[PDB]
Design an enzyme around this catalytic site. Structure first.
Site, PDB file in Angstrom:
ATOM      1  N   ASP A 131       0.856  -1.147   0.375  1.00 13.26           N
ATOM      2  CA  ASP A 131       0.379   0.196  -0.169  1.00 13.26           C
ATOM      3  C   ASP A 131       0.972   1.103   0.094  1.00 13.26           C
ATOM      4  O   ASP A 131       0.691   2.097   0.527  1.00 13.26           O
ATOM      5  CB  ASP A 131      -1.236  -0.110   1.477  1.00 13.26           C
ATOM      6  CG  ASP A 131      -2.406   0.821   0.831  1.00 13.26           C
ATOM      7  OD1 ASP A 131      -2.692   1.691  -0.160  1.00 13.26           O
ATOM      8  OD2 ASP A 131      -3.025   1.415   2.080  1.00 13.26           O
ATOM      9  N   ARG A 135      -0.353   9.316   1.409  1.00 18.75           N
ATOM     10  CA  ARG A 135      -1.237   8.766   2.614  1.00 18.75           C
ATOM     11  C   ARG A 135      -1.021   8.023   3.874  1.00 18.75           C
ATOM     12  O   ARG A 135      -0.817   7.948   4.603  1.00 18.75           O
ATOM     13  CB  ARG A 135      -2.420   9.095   2.052  1.00 18.75           C
ATOM     14  CG  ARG A 135      -2.776   6.997   1.614  1.00 18.75           C
ATOM     15  CD  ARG A 135      -4.141   6.795   1.402  1.00 18.75           C
ATOM     16  NE  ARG A 135      -3.987   5.377   0.761  1.00 18.75           N
ATOM     17  CZ  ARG A 135      -3.988   5.040  -0.219  1.00 18.75           C
ATOM     18  NH1 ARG A 135      -4.170   5.909  -1.344  1.00 18.75           N
ATOM     19  NH2 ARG A 135      -4.187   3.799  -0.999  1.00 18.75           N
ATOM     20  N   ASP A 149       1.876   1.927   8.004  1.00 24.08           N
ATOM     21  CA  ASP A 149       1.460   1.162   7.136  1.00 24.08           C
ATOM     22  C   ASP A 149       0.100   1.152   7.958  1.00 24.08           C
ATOM     23  O   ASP A 149      -0.117  -0.263   8.627  1.00 24.08           O
ATOM     24  CB  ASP A 149       1.759  -0.098   6.642  1.00 24.08           C
ATOM     25  CG  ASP A 149       0.712  -1.358   6.413  1.00 24.08           C
ATOM     26  OD1 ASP A 149      -0.693  -0.521   5.291  1.00 24.08           O
ATOM     27  OD2 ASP A 149       1.150  -2.834   5.990  1.00 24.08           O
TER      28      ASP A 149
HETATM   29  C1  LIG Z   1       0.195  12.061  12.008  1.00 22.64           C
HETATM   30  O1  LIG Z   1       1.207  10.778  13.247  1.00 22.64           O
HETATM   31  C2  LIG Z   1       0.630   9.391  12.929  1.00 22.64           C
HETATM   32  C3  LIG Z   1       1.719   8.763  13.351  1.00 22.64           C
HETATM   33  C4  LIG Z   1       2.014   7.575  13.418  1.00 22.64           C
HETATM   34  C5  LIG Z   1       0.173   6.767  12.916  1.00 22.64           C
HETATM   35  C6  LIG Z   1       0.055   5.396  12.830  1.00 22.64           C
HETATM   36  C7  LIG Z   1       1.005   4.133  12.822  1.00 22.64           C
HETATM   37  C8  LIG Z   1       0.243   2.347  12.474  1.00 22.64           C
HETATM   38  N1  LIG Z   1       1.210   1.880  12.191  1.00 22.64           N
HETATM   39  C9  LIG Z   1       2.057   0.980  11.374  1.00 22.64           C
HETATM   40  O2  LIG Z   1       2.202   1.704   9.883  1.00 22.64           O
HETATM   41  N2  LIG Z   1       2.069   0.015  11.027  1.00 22.64           N
HETATM   42  C10 LIG Z   1       2.499  -0.280  10.591  1.00 22.64           C
HETATM   43  C11 LIG Z   1       4.151   0.202  10.041  1.00 22.64           C
HETATM   44  C12 LIG Z   1       5.154  -0.810   8.556  1.00 22.64           C
HETATM   45  C13 LIG Z   1       5.635  -0.730   7.996  1.00 22.64           C
HETATM   46  C14 LIG Z   1       7.085  -1.410   8.882  1.00 22.64           C
HETATM   47  C15 LIG Z   1       5.842  -0.170   7.187  1.00 22.64           C
HETATM   48  C16 LIG Z   1       5.814  -2.233   6.548  1.00 22.64           C
HETATM   49  N3  LIG Z   1       4.016  -2.021   9.300  1.00 22.64           N
HETATM   50  N4  LIG Z   1       3.464  -1.452  10.049  1.00 22.64           N
HETATM   51  C17 LIG Z   1       2.498  -3.401  10.591  1.00 22.64           C
HETATM   52  C18 LIG Z   1       0.823  -3.063  10.844  1.00 22.64           C
HETATM   53  C19 LIG Z   1       0.271  -3.503  11.150  1.00 22.64           C
HETATM   54  C20 LIG Z   1       0.792  -4.980  11.612  1.00 22.64           C
HETATM   55  C21 LIG Z   1       0.421  -6.408  12.095  1.00 22.64           C
HETATM   56  C22 LIG Z   1       1.886  -5.116  11.117  1.00 22.64           C
HETATM   57  C23 LIG Z   1       3.499  -3.953  10.829  1.00 22.64           C
HETATM   58  N5  LIG Z   1      -0.727   3.207  13.325  1.00 22.64           N
HETATM   59  N6  LIG Z   1      -0.907   4.683  12.974  1.00 22.64           N
HETATM   60  C24 LIG Z   1      -0.523   7.698  12.274  1.00 22.64           C
HETATM   61  C25 LIG Z   1      -1.793   7.037  11.974  1.00 22.64           C
HETATM   62  C26 LIG Z   1      -0.158   8.635  13.043  1.00 22.64           C
END
Ligand SMILES: COc1ccc(-c2cc(NC(=O)Nc3cc(C(C)(C)C)nn3-c3ccc(C)cc3)[nH]n2)c(C)c1
Length: 263
Positions: A131, A135, A149
């Protein structure tokens, strides 16, 4: 670690798959206030879904890359909260739209290189993002972007980001590191276009027909010609002809140095 008393919730950031996401403030041992995103999970979820929700915190604690979003902590006890570091500048696409009259091309090449480095790390562990879009990128500072993500389609009808997807992903739902390379160049086109949406002039159903005929996203106005050549290689119909992220880091660093010398 992290006690609930240290975290204060302020306003709803948005709705995540498992529950609402809140903007908050985490106060540490020093008394320093850290802006946070607090991810929640519905109480009536299945054990399987509660496990999937918590798996994000178990995984993300192992990530310590300068261009990947940072996990601050986890409060396991009900209500279970995943505490991510908040980047108040927000998403890169909206940031580019707001600052279009002051951003230099060198800065846009810098952001592309920083995301490519994050993807080269994911490639080294045979993980796919699936993805890649502006965004899903956050602005930590004007000098640093961070890949996340957090889209509602998610370690790795529509729902799907058709306008960013490779032809093998649209036709057969095949997602490889080569398909991420195609998506990454679509993300670079969004960056060099100051947050424009790819194929905004088409409906989702027209996309595959255009790609099969050999049509591609046109070069954005301020995109250096050598960078557009790299984007077109990432958009080869044949996945085997797309560069690996590890080598694309080398090609992007060459473009960055070329741009810096002119600037
Ligand atoms: C405004 O400031 C903000 C700060 C943070 C956020 C924010 C970040 C996340 N989480 C996230 O990015 N997880 C992630 C990243 C990656 C790779 C490493 C990039 C691929 N894998 N997974 C992952 C997701 C799910 C599972 C199960 C495992 C891994 N949620 N909300 C928001 C929305 C706003």
């Amino acid at each position: 670690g992290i006690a609930r008393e240290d975290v204060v919730l302020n306003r709803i950031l948005g709705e995540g798959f498992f529950g609402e996401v809140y903007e908050g403030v985490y106060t540490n041992h020093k008394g320093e206030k850290i802006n946070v995103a607090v991810k929640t999970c519905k109480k009536d979820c299945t054990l399987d879904n509660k496990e999937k929700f918590m798996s994000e915190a178990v995984i993300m604690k192992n990530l310590d890359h300068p261009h990947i979003v940072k996990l601050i902590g986890i409060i396991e006890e009900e209500p279970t909260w995943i505490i991510m570091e908040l980047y108040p500048y927000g998403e890169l696409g909206h940031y580019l739209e707001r600052n279009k009259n002051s951003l230099k091309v060198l800065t846009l090449v810098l952001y592309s290189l920083q995301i490519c480095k994050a993807m080269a790390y994911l490639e080294s562990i045979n993980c796919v993002h699936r993805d890649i879009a502006v965004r899903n990128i956050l602005v930590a500072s004007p000098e640093c972007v961070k890949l996340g993500d957090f889209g509602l389609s998610r370690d790795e009808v529509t729902r799907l980001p058709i306008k960013w997807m490779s032809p093998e992903s649209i036709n057969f739902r095949r997602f490889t590191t080569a398909s991420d390379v195609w998506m990454f160049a679509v993300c670079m086109w969004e960056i060099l276009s100051f947050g424009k949406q790819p194929f905004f002039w088409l409906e989702n159903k027209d996309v595959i027909g255009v790609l099969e005929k050999g049509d591609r996203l046109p070069k954005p106005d301020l995109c250096p010609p050598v960078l557009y050549t790299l984007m077109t290689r990432c958009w080869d119909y044949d996945p085997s002809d797309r560069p690996r992220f590890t080598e694309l880091v080398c090609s992007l660093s060459d473009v960055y140095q070329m741009e810096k010398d002119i600037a």
